[PDB]
Amino acid sequence: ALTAEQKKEILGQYGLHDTDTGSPEAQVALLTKRIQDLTEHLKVHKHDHHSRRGLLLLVGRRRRLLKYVAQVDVARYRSLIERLGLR
Amino acid sequence: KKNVPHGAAHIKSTFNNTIVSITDPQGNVIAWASSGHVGFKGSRKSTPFAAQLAAENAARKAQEHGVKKVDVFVKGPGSGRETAIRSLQAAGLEVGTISDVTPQPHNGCRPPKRRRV
Amino acid sequence: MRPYEIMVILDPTLDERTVAPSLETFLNVIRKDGGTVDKVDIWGRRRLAYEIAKHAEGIYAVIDVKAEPATVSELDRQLNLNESVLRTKVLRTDKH
Amino acid sequence: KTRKCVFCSKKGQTIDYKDTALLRTYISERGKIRARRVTGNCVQHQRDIAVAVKNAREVALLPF
RNA sequence: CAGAUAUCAGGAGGAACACCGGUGGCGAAGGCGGGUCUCUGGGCAGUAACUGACGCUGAGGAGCGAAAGCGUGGGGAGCGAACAGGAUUAGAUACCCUGGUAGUCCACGCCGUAAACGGUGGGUACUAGGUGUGGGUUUCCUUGGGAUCCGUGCCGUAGCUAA
């Protein structure tokens, strides 16, 4: 899962500032890295069929926050988009 | 011949019959007596009277090989458990100990399905 | 790295004196690979509840290692290639 | 029985698989397992004891 | 009858995990239970630390999805369809016995239907209680008791239902 230390350093890296866990970019980074983690757990547990639901739920939450990022300010949206290399 | 001081009443107590195999402590059935051995077949093989008859015949063979002290090793449930027990008691083989030697597949193999008559 | 409380059952044939050097001669690789502090608690000459491999008594060994899962996995692979060992049990001290 | 537990109420005690004597106090003659509510103890202790008894039966220290 | 049954010992096989095993939990639902290890799923609880309405539903569409069945290669100890004899019977093809092939298990696939039902769609704000009951935390006696939030039963208010 999102280890308590890797999520914290990620929040420091891409978060808007310190202690601002839950900011849209912050959650995007956290869930993005969690998704990257599960990417290979599924590729070795080829028949897990049970963590994929959490995969999809977190993906949907990431997009549901991405839209809020874009609507408030497209600039930060693009910034994070090319920061994480999404699409 | 030979003499067996202590025997074991390995009673294959099927509902079909109680095959009373007396076994030396080595683990060899020195002799056995079932319902058919006395002469009971079919339903009479499964009658309670066949149980004491088989046990008594086995115990007579036991005395014939000088067997007096026997511990009772009864297998699965059948017709005449305690009946064969006190037959052996009254036929020269005191009870000693009673042990239900029944197989226990602890949720293991698959048997046939069932019967409805 | 995780704290693994490895339980080993050892032959009744050998002597208790040889029980331990055979134990550090296999814990050496664990220590050299994971840097694992080991607490070797050995108490032999105890019966088994059921006879195993035509034997119902043996030697009980408790070893508290702080080793990564890979290292204790290597140990289990080695804790069964030996004739003296009888049963191995590596436990995750976590809520697992 | 009928207490809060012998652990959740006595508020000091522990369960170990190596402590085969303490576990044996709850097992049957052959090692059969009491129901979830036979011994009157808080449920988590019952479940952990059950798993420990499974492991003990596997490791051949209790009458299986 | 050759040594069958049996008894002991041994080996082989294949499958499943009795007891724990239950309004008790978990899981979106089909489902989950021998033990170990690894990865991973989600929930609940106390601090707002933070984001600052990022809410819900959701046609199309998406996958998952009981069992069976078929494709591909194995397994098969047992069971066992189909198919075999014997038995009641007027008839057995049926109930019963005497066996066993695919299947049943595994691997990779197919399909998508089950009475796949709280027969009660998802989500949210209000309406007496009482009592079992899982997880938590707190608060009040000296563990004892209370509160709270979440899971899970039954009975019973209002009110509702044709009942």
Swiss-Prot record, chain A:
SS bonds (residue pairs)? none
Its Gene Ontology cellular component terms are: cytosolic small ribosomal subunit
| Family, similarity comment | Belongs to the universal ribosomal protein uS15 family.
Could you describe the subunit structure of this protein?
Answer: Part of the 30S ribosomal subunit. Forms a bridge to the 50S subunit in the 70S ribosome, contacting the 23S rRNA.
Keywords of the record:
Ribonucleoprotein, Ribosomal protein, RNA-binding, rRNA-binding
Q: Which NCBIfam families match?
A: S15_bact (TIGR00952)
Record InterPro entries? Ribosomal_uS15, Ribosomal_uS15_bac-type, uS15_NS1_RNA-bd_sf
Q: Which PANTHER family match?
A: RIBOSOMAL PROTEIN S15, BACTERIAL AND ORGANELLAR (PTHR23321), SMALL RIBOSOMAL SUBUNIT PROTEIN US15M (PTHR23321:SF26)
Give the transmembrane ranges: none
Name-wise, this protein is Small ribosomal subunit protein uS15
Please tell me whether the keyword Signal is annotated for this protein. no
Recorded GO MF terms: rRNA binding; structural constituent of ribosome
| Pfam families per record | Ribosomal_S15
List this protein's GO terms for biological process.
Answer: translation
Q: Per its database record, what is this protein's job? A: One of the primary rRNA binding proteins, it binds directly to 16S rRNA where it helps nucleate assembly of the platform of the 30S subunit by binding and bridging several RNA helices of the 16S rRNA. Forms an intersubunit bridge (bridge B4) with the 23S rRNA of the 50S subunit in the ribosome.
Curated annotation (Swiss-Prot), chain B:
* Gene Ontology molecular function, alphabetical: rRNA binding; structural constituent of ribosome
One GO CC annotation: ribonucleoprotein complex
Q: Does the keyword Ribonucleoprotein apply?
A: yes
Q: Where is this region: Disordered?
A: 98-117
Gene Ontology BP annotations: translation
Alphabetically ordered keywords of this record: Ribonucleoprotein, Ribosomal protein, RNA-binding, rRNA-binding
Give the residue spans that cross the bilayer.
none
As for family, the record states: Belongs to the universal ribosomal protein uS11 family.
Q: How does it assemble?
A: Part of the 30S ribosomal subunit. Interacts with proteins S7 and S18. Binds to IF-3.
Q: What does this protein do?
A: Located on the platform of the 30S subunit, it bridges several disparate RNA helices of the 16S rRNA. Forms part of the Shine-Dalgarno cleft in the 70S ribosome.
Q: What is this protein called?
A: Small ribosomal subunit protein uS11
Q: Where does this protein come from, organism-wise?
A: Mycolicibacterium smegmatis (strain ATCC 700084 / mc(2)155)
Instruction: Give the residues of the full protein shown.
Output: 22 to 138 of 138
Curated annotation (Swiss-Prot), chain D:
Instruction: Quote the protein name from its UniProt record.
Output: Small ribosomal subunit protein bS18B
Under the subunit heading, UniProt states: Part of the 30S ribosomal subunit. Forms a tight heterodimer with protein bS6.
Keyword list, A-Z = Ribonucleoprotein, Ribosomal protein, RNA-binding, rRNA-binding
**Gene Ontology CC entries for this record:** cytosolic small ribosomal subunit
Question: Is Ribosomal protein found in the keyword set?
Answer: yes
Describe the function of this protein.
Answer: Binds as a heterodimer with protein bS6 to the central domain of the 16S rRNA, where it helps stabilize the platform of the 30S subunit.
| Molecular-function GO term, any one | small ribosomal subunit rRNA binding
**One biological process GO term for this chain?**
translation
Q: Which family does it belong to?
A: Belongs to the bacterial ribosomal protein bS18 family.
